[PDB]
Symmetry: D2
Subunit: 386 residues, 4 copies
């Protein structure tokens, strides 16, 4: 059991299972994959769809006729399998020209080229039916303080995203943008390093309604942050347009382990939250089968992503549906948390002696929150030890 169906809306980047295993200290351990083969293998595993960087689908420098042929072949594999392309993105990090950034490169000519490169792939994403266009500004940032005036850079980042929003509007496209934060790597510090920074930035754009976030499990964890908390704030803001699922073991390089690996309990609380909130977007895995693996290991790792989600979905749902858990939630006053503090209004609060003059703070203080009992119920449910 825990067999995925395309109805689970599990998606994978071409660059995930297609990662050849090059890391900063070693050569490739696997040959390149034909995107057509990935589409087929992923479909067989129960995937709903795939995603791509322009340069994953179409090799850098391709001529227009090479371009069409790559696209034609990919389109046939999609038609052959029933697979979808719900999201696409631009590679503004691999080519040396982007060594100081794309949209916030100090060189003006590079920023212009980065926008043109982007715009080109948005048209293709729309043609393949993508609803979301991701941006991961991996090269936007610095290793040293003087190299990047961040206020100027944010000015340039806003300029770029506003122009993209003008473009999609002018073309009548329904696609929306999702900004993917990362705190560092490959730059020493990257701009908009967390969900928070991305969310705040978007509120300064000309048409904020066109932009949301694409948070990645591992990236927030690289800042030691609580990824379920960040997702909750994103949901609260109405800005969870897409998500990247994977695993990460602490504050270190971006590991991109399969989903469920890494911080297992955070994975549980994440699935709990996504299902509870009714998140309806793709369940996208941005991961890398470890370079220790051969192609059988690649597909095993991809299957594991999906499996682990489905297992965690079952355990979270059983947790929430358990009457003993519902009673614990009441004992911990989660029901009170959801009630307004002062629907009676400011003046009635000021006039309420039960809120200050006659508040027994010592009796309130004495009330245990019973959070450990609640958390052991969650643990027992996660491990199937009820």
């Amino acid at each position: 059991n825990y067999q995925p169906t395309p109805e689970d809306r599990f998606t994978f980047g071409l660059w995930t299972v297609g990662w050849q295993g090059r890391d900063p200290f070693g050569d490739a351990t696997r040959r390149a994959l034909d995107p057509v083969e990935s589409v087929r293998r992923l479909a067989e595993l129960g995937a709903h769809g795939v995603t791509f960087h322009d340069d994953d689908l179409i090799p850098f420098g391709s001529s227009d006729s090479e371009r069409e042929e790559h696209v034609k072949r990919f389109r046939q594999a999609l038609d052959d399998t029933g697979m979808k392309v719900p999201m696409a993105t631009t590679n503004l990090f691999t080519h040396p020209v982007f060594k100081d950034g794309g949209f916030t490169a100090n060189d003006r000519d590079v920023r212009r080229y980065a926008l043109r490169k982007t715009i080109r792939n948005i048209d293709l994403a729309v043609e393949l039916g993508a609803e979301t266009y991701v941006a991961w500004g991996g090269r936007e940032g610095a290793e040293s303080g003087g190299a990047k005036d961040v206020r100027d850079a944010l000015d340039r980042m806003k300029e770029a995203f506003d122009l993209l929003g003008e473009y999609v509007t002018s073309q009548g496209y329904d696609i929306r943008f999702a900004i993917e934060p990362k705190p560092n790597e490959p730059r020493g510090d990257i701009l908009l390093p967390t969900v928070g920074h991305a969310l705040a930035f978007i509120e300064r754009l000309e048409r904020p309604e066109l932009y949301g976030v694409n948070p990645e499990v591992g990236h927030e964890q690289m800042a030691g942050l609580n990824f379920p908390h960040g997702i909750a704030q994103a949901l609260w803001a109405g800005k969870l347009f897409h998500i990247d699922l994977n695993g990460q073991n602490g504050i270190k390089y971006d590991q991109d382990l399969r989903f469920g690996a890494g911080d297992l309990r955070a994975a549980f609380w994440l699935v709990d939250l996504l299902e509870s909130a009714g998140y309806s977007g793709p369940r996208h895995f941005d991961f890398k089968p470890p370079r220790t693996e051969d192609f059988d290991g690649v597909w095993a790792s991809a299957a594991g992503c999906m499996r682990n989600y489905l297992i965690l979905k079952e355990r979270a749902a059983a947790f929430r549906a358990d009457p003993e858990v519902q009673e614990a939630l009441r004992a911990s006053r989660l029901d009170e948390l959801a009630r307004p503090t002062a629907a009676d209004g400011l003046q009635a609060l000021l006039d309420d002696r039960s809120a200050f003059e006659e508040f027994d703070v010592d009796a309130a203080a004495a009330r245990g929150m019973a959070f450990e009992r609640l958390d052991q119920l969650a643990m027992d449910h996660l491990l199937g030890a009820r």
Copy 2:
């Protein structure tokens, strides 16, 4: 030299130099300080002002006549010294009643009390002439996933800050709020953990213009983030209402070292940025003289805060004024970074073959950024080795 004047607008919390040295593993190493004595000693050192939590100035549980006497004495020390009170805040973390939070406590009665406690001290802050009212929600958060629905909690946080904004408006007060992020400690994860999260949250409040951030050097660093970058985004947003200066050595407990200790180069880039941006608010130190110290060490540590700022101010200004640095900034294209990418507009960008069709990416790529030469000029300036 590097003698501070009250015109430098250096301020200190009563709780900084007054910290008795209790930590989670040890008892107090210093006696409590009378706020009157701190005002006097700080004034002698060249401080401009002091700040306070309600419970620092007035002991918890004080009767109204004890309250007035505490206030009267403090007011006399201010009058005696010419010291100001530019900021104040509420203690919503020490009393056991706040063990699950103030504004986002699961218990509704506690949330109400937290608002009343806050409102009371805002009136006093206004009387003492404070322009900024800080909120550090140190207890807002969780140790376990089930204990806190973060969407409900953010609903309650918004409710609380909106009511405070309604209150100050109804009283015609000119004071503004500054939210102070911290990613963890004392809660396992704290809500609005970074400048980003705080900035984004504020855009959801009813009158966002009333709220900014009070970022703390050490807190952002506890998330491994670049504090000068975060300050830049805060400035970019127009939301740097206040700042907390101190030192931190990496991702660990909140150390609250004196300013300049910790990450020395980040301190330099921070001062560079504050002075360059014309930040005009207090230069506030939220720090703790290490508990190894006696009272002479306390005042030495406080003096060091101010000294280090002034030294770093001198070095940053010399860096920026150096013609050789100005030429390096041009060689690294910082001048281009400040120019709009495409003031010519979207269509002209789309029509510009120099931006794509005829862009020589390999020539662009070949251009070194010369950032290391620039950074060694900054290093030489910092260390006075030019």
Copy 3:
């Protein structure tokens, strides 16, 4: 099920369930516990024993007759319950006198007093039948570079532990020492910050056979290290004299969550390793029920420690006993890892053309390690989803 028995050798410090909830930002949330009550409650939960700091059992400053009475009462609770005292330790961190350390305090008189304090409690530990005497040098370290010459300090640390070893030898005691590393907190950096540093240090003592390590889950994790790896090296060295079990969520302050909380998968691999290696010492919990909790929460949290160990023990054993797992381990060549590289000796290795001249590196490289399939089997076993 997953009911502990005293035969599981689960032990708890008096200071764990007795922690009143004081943290650096808040007052106590629970009253002090009588050690007699803790012994009784723990026994009821299935604990095997308790541990203590001198100052937990006997209040600082107690007179000899107060001392005897405290001891007499404790001894009656042990007799009443069948509970044991397998380990004890000294408090060289709470009293202000230890603000710069115990054994490595800059003040010579303090170092002498720290040794006398220690020696006194070793005699009591022996009387109560302890086999292990722990040392956690929480105050040994620095916040600044000039304050502590580390070579001099290590000289003093060696001097102290050698004198303790001379003492126990001179008294014919069979007790052994276990050094407990912590990388920071409460000092900015603490000496012997990891298992590694402790292990290396011990090899410089006069009678190294008398000293091992007492690693703590959360402490190594505070350095972002892999606690199962560290335990393995400790076991490899023959130096795992004791262990502290708890949970920690990343690189931050010492959280001391209940065992199984924090990094759940690391807890699984840890239990796997302890059981597989035949670790026969106490399963000791150094934890803190969160200060959100009342006394019912304290005992629930303590029960959870034990429960989670037993659940993880069952899953690890089923993993290792699973024939499909045994085949995967062979496919991943774990059997080869356990074979000597070159039992044939150096010259035969040099003479073996299969090892270099005629080694097909490309064929070797092409062999996938099949580690992901193995790890998903471990995941399925952990979550009971086989």
Copy 4:
């Protein structure tokens, strides 16, 4: 001024200035350097010598006649410049064959090949006159718990280093080994992750006198550890055979910034310690000019390494020579720290009522350590603000 001379014994790896700028997200930004050119440029900058991996000097797969020619040319550049080769090492991480390790690869045939590869380059290192042979087991470790039995792996690591020690002994070579710890990257966790673990491991080898450590600034910092403390323990053990100098900004990927960048104050305390201890080995930089740079930036960055050391050497020496600093060190009792705790012996300590019975702990406690005043003197000296 701050002009290096070859007498400063500054050395650089061929792979540092020769790094082409490939990172996990981007292609090379600089062409490959001929080792002959690096030798020449480095010599011009004031370098004393260079170091190499076998595969840096001789391309993988080179035939014996290609080998000789590469070596001949390199030897001519050394002769031409007066440059030395004090250290060499083996590349056991780049080739896919090493994807699960060299000495601790699960595959036995790979471990054998890794030893042969190593032995071959030791003979060449000796011929070029190297005194130290470094080992960085970057691939030794795991991403998942079941993939690597660490006790078996350490057995294999010991086997490998013992065989290497047998080899150099059998050849009468005077070269010594230096193990270079790294906590993670490229493996999820790496074996012997810190100086501590390496030091402890060495004490289990057959001829421990042949092995020391080669600690790297950035690597220890990747574990949030205090690199000057670790170096002190290495020196204390007599095991600082070599060192790698660079910069790192916190717990993240291995940045390999130029020395002095990163944690500037740690760089100061490090230089203070090396000079104070009389470290006489190479001052080796294992760094990477950021990929933003062209070749002029590469040489600027390399020059900066040397400059920053010399500036920090001058400031540390002035700190220590300052009579006001010497008085502060006495006020902080650093002189007492260096005195034995109890040269009078155990019995006299037990008999000394001044050490316990009549020790005034409250008076001792009341004595401030004056560490902040001392640290601001160090700060003033570092910044040239005395």
